Swiss-Prot record, chain A:
Protein's recorded name: Large ribosomal subunit protein eL18
PANTHER family found in the cross-reference section: 60S RIBOSOMAL PROTEIN L18, LARGE RIBOSOMAL SUBUNIT PROTEIN EL18
One term under GO cellular component: cytosolic large ribosomal subunit
Keyword Ribosomal protein: yes
Gene encoding the protein: rpl18e
UniProtKB/Swiss-Prot annotation, chain B:
Sequence similarity: Belongs to the universal ribosomal protein uL15 family.
GO MF annotations, alphabetized: rRNA binding; structural constituent of ribosome
Skewed-composition ranges (Basic residues): 1-28
Swiss-Prot/TrEMBL GO biological process terms: translation
Keyword list, A-Z: Ribonucleoprotein, Ribosomal protein, RNA-binding, rRNA-binding
Gene name linked to the record: rpl15
Gene Ontology cellular-component annotations: cytosolic large ribosomal subunit
Database matches in Pfam families: Ribosomal_L27A (PF00828)
Name of this chain's protein: Large ribosomal subunit protein uL15
The protein's assembly and partners: Part of the 50S ribosomal subunit. Interacts weakly with proteins L18e and L32e.
SUPFAM superfamilies given in the database record: Ribosomal proteins L15p and L18e (SSF52080)
Protein's job: Binds to the 23S rRNA.
Organism: Haloarcula marismortui (strain ATCC 43049 / DSM 3752 / JCM 8966 / VKM B-1809)
From Swiss-Prot, chain C:
Protein name stated in the entry: Large ribosomal subunit protein uL4
Biased composition (Basic and acidic residues): 42-53
GO molecular function: rRNA binding; structural constituent of ribosome
Species annotation: Haloarcula marismortui (strain ATCC 43049 / DSM 3752 / JCM 8966 / VKM B-1809) (Halobacterium marismortui)
Function: One of the primary rRNA binding proteins, this protein initially binds near the 5'-end of the 23S rRNA. It is important during the early stages of 50S assembly. Makes multiple contacts with different domains of the 23S rRNA in the assembled 50S subunit.
One CC-aspect GO term: ribosome
Origin: domain of life: Archaea
Subunit note: Part of the 50S ribosomal subunit. Interacts weakly with proteins L18e, L24 and L37e. Has been cross-linked to L18e.
Length: 115, 145, 196
RNA sequence: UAUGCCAGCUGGUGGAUUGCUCGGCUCAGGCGCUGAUGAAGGACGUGCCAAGCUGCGAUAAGCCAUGGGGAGCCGCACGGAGGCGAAGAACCAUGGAUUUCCGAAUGAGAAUCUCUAACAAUUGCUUCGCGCAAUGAGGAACCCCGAGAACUGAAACAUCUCAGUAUCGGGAGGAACAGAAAACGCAAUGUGAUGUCGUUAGUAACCGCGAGUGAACGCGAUACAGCCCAAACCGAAGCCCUCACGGGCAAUGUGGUGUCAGGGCUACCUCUCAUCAGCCGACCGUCUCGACGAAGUCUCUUGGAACAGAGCGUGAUACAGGGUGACAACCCCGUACUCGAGACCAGUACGACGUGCGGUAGUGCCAGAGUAGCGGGGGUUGGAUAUCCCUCGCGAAUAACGCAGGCAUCGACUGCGAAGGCUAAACACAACCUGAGACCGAUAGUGAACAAGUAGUGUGAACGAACGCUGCAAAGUACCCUCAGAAGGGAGGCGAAAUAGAGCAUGAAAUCAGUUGGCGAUCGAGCGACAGGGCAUACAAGGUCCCUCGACGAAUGACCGACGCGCGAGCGUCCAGUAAGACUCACGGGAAGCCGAUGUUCUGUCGUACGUUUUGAAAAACGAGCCAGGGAGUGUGUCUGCAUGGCAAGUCUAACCGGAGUAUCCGGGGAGGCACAGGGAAACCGACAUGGCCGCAGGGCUUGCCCGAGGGCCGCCGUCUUCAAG
RNA sequence: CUGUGUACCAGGAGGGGAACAACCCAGAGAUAGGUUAAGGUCCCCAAGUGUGGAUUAAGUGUAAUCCUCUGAAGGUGGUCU
RNA sequence: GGCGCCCAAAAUGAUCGGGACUCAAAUCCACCACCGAGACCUGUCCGUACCACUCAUACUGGUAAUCGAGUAGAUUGGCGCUCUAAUUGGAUGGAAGUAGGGGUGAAAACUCCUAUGGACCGAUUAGUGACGAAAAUCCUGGCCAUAGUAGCAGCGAUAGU
RNA sequence: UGGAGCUUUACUGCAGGCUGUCGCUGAG
RNA sequence: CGAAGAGUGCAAGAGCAAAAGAUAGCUUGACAGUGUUCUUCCCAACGAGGAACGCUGACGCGAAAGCGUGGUCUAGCGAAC
């Protein structure tokens, strides 16, 4: 039983999208976010660096942390970013919230789920 | 509603037969009783091993992996730039209450680094130099003979 | 030691009675005995406090501060006002008011006094709290946040709470955890609050 | 229909319940010694009438003074009589008077009395005289010094554990104890008296190496403060009593000097401002107590009463709380603001008097002995070779010396001077004062809201209950009748209410009397559930129900008739999946104890309680007479999951500090913990920010093909063991 | 008494078995209509005093299972085929 | 070969459950028709699980021949009690409690009416627990049957009228 | 893997007695 | 003549014939290190002990393949301090 109202709306949004638009990643991300917090992702830059490719939004069904180096110009969408992750990322790419990703890409196309 | 809250009316509160939840017999003895007999399974076996050197004759080195130093070069703008030069002793936390600072070779060194520490590992040198870098021992580091 | 001050003993088997400790023919000590000890009573040793990570708490004070700038939220919480803009900001000279009524006029002029009319109605609670001095309770109304000193002029207003910008807390901004209290900041207080 | 069953009604009994709180329980702040100048405690007295409580002491619920206070008063305790008070009483603060006997109990003795001047007894001083003094005993716990179990844990048990606990003996104070290094030993170019708090840490150490036990240095805080002798060199330069005279002490040393920044002496330099002795003497702050203190008692309605509803109005640096005939900021106390007093801080801080700091050179002048240390035996401790202590025995040096730095010896190095002493502050407790409360609310909460340590039990040590509520106002029932009657009853009076009339708010159940409904003297026992009948029923809070016919019509499913089989009972085919078919609805008619429902009873079907023990319970296994009320997963610390939330290569502060709206809260504090690298007993050494293949989800595409986090299978890397290898 | 495999009782209602933990039917939400199962159809008690035929005269018998329902060795010009 | 007969004795009253039964109401061989569960079939509803839609675990629609018994135990939603807070209500035009009665809910329980009572009482949300009794030869208090019953006689002191 | 009383050449200890030795403890 | 009735240390069952038995000769593998697997403990966790099977070292015998990690196999065994 999530207690955070925001995480709760974000989930309702992801669903509305996956159902209305051609989403599936969004419904897949909502699925995981509905599971308990220990299962949510905690990803450091190093991993996003190792598997991300330009022109393919990285979607982390959790929170992005700041260990390691990110040089690729990638747009990372996540539930949250640590103050440092958002900073290190903005230097080479763009950090956006899933609320925005669903906004520009309700069809959830050209995306890479990273955990 | 919690388990506890649902117990009224149950009589045994989950203990099974009411002849169960009595004294230490239901636990096979108090504390670790039977650790070498009935409740012997999954217990470090009985024994006496090794020895300990006196605490004031022990040395605690402060260590750091190249990977940590390398991943933060540019970030360490407050730590020299030449043909980067870094005095580890000024990077590693816990360096005061430590006998000496040692650089370990875990990870990659994607830069030309000139490192200054009291000690390095064979692999730490190989990596730093292999990147056109150098390694310099402190005067304390002179205790390497 | 309540209920334990007795040498009462149990005869045991023999006289057709349950094995209950008795003294002078009256049962004692045991929990099922009238005048007996309390089996699992309230304990002094119990830690009745709650820890709160400073970051989590500061985030709550800021989140409560924000709730203040939402007239809809504020109206939802229950307050009775007639403005569109909230929080209500006032001239630093507010801090110089001395008479309570000088503040009433200002609140009427600001169409905020209705909330005080709301608090001007105490409730006589149901239950024994009254026997312990908790006979009354009243609605929470306007919170005045100044910066130099808590407004002595406003504090006595029905349900009014006065606070200073450097230490105004979550309970001030959200009485009982209910976000969106009808606030009125002082121009200077408004600024100091920016860095909490 | 007697005896009787079930339910209800009226009235009892009972005292649950609801409401109320003069008492508790807990936390917080403050404050903190009494006694031979006879305490604490106890006994016995003491009032106009006086048994209990409280007070007081032959001056006896009191006497005196100063201040406050004020028209009233004579305690709890609402009676009667009488008295006191403007000669200012009561009442309160402070100070004083009186203060029987027993009691440390002290002239001797004694169950609170007696017998013939008394510090008894032990001491110090001593005018050697009890002349001057001291000790004694009490106190809620706290504190210091000694003596010191067992149940228990180890699933037995002896070491160990419980535990240096319970308990015992001695003793101090408002706090105790400790304390200015023969320290520490992050070993150092380092710290710098002592407690305490947080941490270091369940680490080191102990241990049938089992169960278990368990520090320190340091660090962060709190608070901070350092000094005095013995001796050397001086040698009566001195101290105590007394007004004095005079006496006592003191060469076995009073007094000066000095005290590891060693000192002394000799010779110089310079200087005072250290220290020590003594004088003056707070601010502020905290606790408590006290003075002052705004604004409605307006209208209408209801009511026994307005603090209610409706309307009009007002204060607020005061909308805490209480009282008042019902919900009150504005009726009364008080509360905010402001002010005063006492106590504590504290005889402290500051200031001031006196004194004199310190430094050079020479000088083997001085510097605590049954000690340091060793051995025999024990205890204790984490103390292990390396804790601390007791006991028996042995036993050194002299600063050019000695001790310590976790086995012993020798050297080096570093630290430090034991065997004499004092010392504020920060910390414990809770008698006492005040405050507070998500504590209890009269079988609770104290044993105790009441007569409470009461009544009562025991030879004694000791043990030990129960009892709260009339009313707005006693208006607490006049008069009358009855009666043996200050009884009780009837009538009457008061009041909103006497079904508020004395354990007198409310008034449950068990249960009792009377009575209503149903059953009832030919009939059968888990007392019922379900269905259907009888009889019973004021309203209200439920309004449905019955009968014709008609519509719909699941599974199922015919009679009759016709034809054809069978020895026969009977069957087959067609009629026909038709008529019929539960429920539901519509039309028409009807019911008002009528339908539901409730009570009881009758009929039918099923049925030998409930809880427990048990393979098996109606059990001839266990428990309870009945009812009400009471009656069992709670706390701390540690560990390990889990859900949610913050932050994230980090994360969290602890003690504590500042602020403030003063236990909350805002800010500060990262000491330290866990995480960020492991392997090894140790020495010591020290890793994949990805190299390959599968492939879920998801993405892409030209729809089987790519990309494929996570995951899966391998490689390789660190280390231990290793002639390698494994 | 002690094994083993299995289904049942325990922890399993409801229908039957006179009653009856584990034998038979049967595994069961509520309510309703219908048709069966085991087992029954002379009465008690729902359904036959059913049909064709045989045997038995002992009240044999009207008793699946069973601690529970007995009936044996030995015999029988009882009677039927 | 079928049925039967002898063999064949037990303690309070005989038995196939009983009555009772003889071309049977017995036994055996065939057959015919019926009775009889909660099983099976059928209508409606409930719960649960899964599906579709959805923010929803709220509605709505759909699927269940292959869902519907349960001791010990595991898991989850909900009822009720105390006091705290926030939000918001009721009460002298009569609160709580109690008695009798009506309505809802599978249920814990909720609610109304009448009488009594005569002053306090809730709801929602978040908390807080000395939070629920039919049982312990459980405790304390009260009360009934026992019962107008036993005793009020017995002793070397029969005591009276 | 209850308790207590009692027993003994049960296990383990503790008083007590005997005996040696050191101190007290000295001269030839 | 004779597949095995002998012998093979010891219970019992099992194995063995140009041998696993007998005789002769030679030899010390009854060796060191480290594992895999099974067993102990079916299924299914549990130690010591055991066995089969590897890798490395050093050896013996043999022409050599090969055999030898004790006696043909299943008993002959023991934690911490
Ligand atoms: Cl990562
Ligand atoms: Cl219907
Ligand atoms: Cl529990
Ligand atoms: Cl529910
Ligand atoms: Mg255990
Ligand atoms: Mg009690
Ligand atoms: Mg209440
Ligand atoms: Mg034990
Ligand atoms: Mg102390
Ligand atoms: Mg043991
Ligand atoms: Mg130390
Ligand atoms: Mg009591
Ligand atoms: Mg009464
Ligand atoms: Mg059972
Ligand atoms: Mg019939
Ligand atoms: Mg017979
Ligand atoms: Mg609300
Ligand atoms: Mg109860
Ligand atoms: Mg009788
Ligand atoms: Mg014994
Ligand atoms: Na007592
Ligand atoms: Na506590
Ligand atoms: Na005091
Ligand atoms: Na004398
Ligand atoms: Na039992
Ligand atoms: Na039973
Ligand atoms: Na029986
Ligand atoms: Na009785
Ligand atoms: Na005994
Ligand atoms: Sr016990
Ligand atoms: Sr063992
Ligand atoms: Sr640190
Ligand atoms: Sr007995
Ligand atoms: Sr200091
Ligand atoms: Sr000395
Ligand atoms: Sr040494
Ligand atoms: Sr009582
Ligand atoms: Sr006695
Ligand atoms: Sr009358
Ligand atoms: Sr039809
Ligand atoms: Sr922090
Ligand atoms: Sr991988
Ligand atoms: Sr018939
Ligand atoms: Sr017939
Ligand atoms: Sr026939
Ligand atoms: Sr029998
Ligand atoms: Sr038989
Ligand atoms: Sr026979
Ligand atoms: Sr069910
Ligand atoms: Sr079920
Ligand atoms: Sr099931
Ligand atoms: Sr309880
Ligand atoms: Sr009686
Ligand atoms: Sr007589
Ligand atoms: Sr007699
Ligand atoms: Sr072999």
């Amino acid at each position: 039983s999530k207690t955070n109202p925001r995480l709760s709306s974000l989930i309702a949004d992801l669903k509305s999208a996956a159902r209305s638009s051609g989403g599936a990643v969004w419904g897949d991300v909502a699925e995981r976010l509905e599971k308990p917090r220990r299962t949510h992702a905690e990803v450091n830059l190093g991993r996003i660096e190792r598997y991300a490719q330009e022109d393919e939004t990285v979607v982390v069904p959790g929170k992005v942390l700041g260990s390691g180096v990110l040089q690729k110009d990638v747009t990372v969408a996540a539930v949250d970013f640590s103050g440092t992750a958002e900073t290190k990322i903005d230097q080479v790419g763009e950090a956006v919230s899933l609320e925005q990703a669903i906004e520009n890409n309700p069809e959830g196309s050209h995306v890479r789920v990273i955990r | 509603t919690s388990k506890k809250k649902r117990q009224r009316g149950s009589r045994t509160h989950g203990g099974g037969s009411h002849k169960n939840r009595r004294g230490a017999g239901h636990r096979g003895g108090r504390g670790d009783a039977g650790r070498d007999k009935h409740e012997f399974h999954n217990h470090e076996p009985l024994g006496k091993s090794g020895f300990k050197r006196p605490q004031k004759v022990q040395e605690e080195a402060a260590t750091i992996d190249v990977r940590e130093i390398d991943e933060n070069v540019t970030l360490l703008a407050a730590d020299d730039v030449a043909e980067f030069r870094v005095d580890v002793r000024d990077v590693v936390e816990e360096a005061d209450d430590a006998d000496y600072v040692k650089v370990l070779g875990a990870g990659q060194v994607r830069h030309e680094l000139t490192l200054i520490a009291d000690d390095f590992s064979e692999g730490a040198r190989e990596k730093v130099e292999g990147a056109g870098g150098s390694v310099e021992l402190t005067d304390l580091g002179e205790e390497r003979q | 030691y309540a209920g334990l001050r007795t040498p009462a003993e149990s005869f045991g088997s023999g006289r057709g009675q349950a094995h209950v400790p008795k003294l002078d023919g009256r049962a004692r000590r045991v929990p099922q005995a009238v005048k007996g000890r309390s089996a699992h009573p309230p304990k002094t040793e119990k830690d009745r406090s709650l820890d709160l990570n400073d970051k989590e708490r500061q985030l709550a004070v800021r989140s409560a501060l924000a709730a203040t700038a939402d007239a809809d939220l504020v109206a939802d919480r229950g307050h009775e006002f007639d403005r569109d803009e909230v929080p209500v900001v006032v001239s630093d000279d507010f801090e110089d008011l001395v008479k309570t009524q000088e503040v009433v006029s200002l609140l009427e002029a600001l169409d905020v006094h209705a909330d005080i009319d709301r608090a001007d109605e105490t409730k006589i609670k149901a239950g024994q709290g009254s026997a312990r001095g908790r006979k009354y309770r009243r609605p929470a109304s306007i919170l005045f946040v100044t910066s130099d000193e808590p407004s002595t002029a406003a504090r006595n207003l029905a349900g009014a709470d006065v606070a200073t910008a450097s230490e105004v807390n979550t309970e001030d901004l959200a009485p009982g955890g209910a976000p969106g209290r009808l606030t009125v900041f002082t121009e200077s207080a408004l600024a100091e609050v920016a860095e909490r």
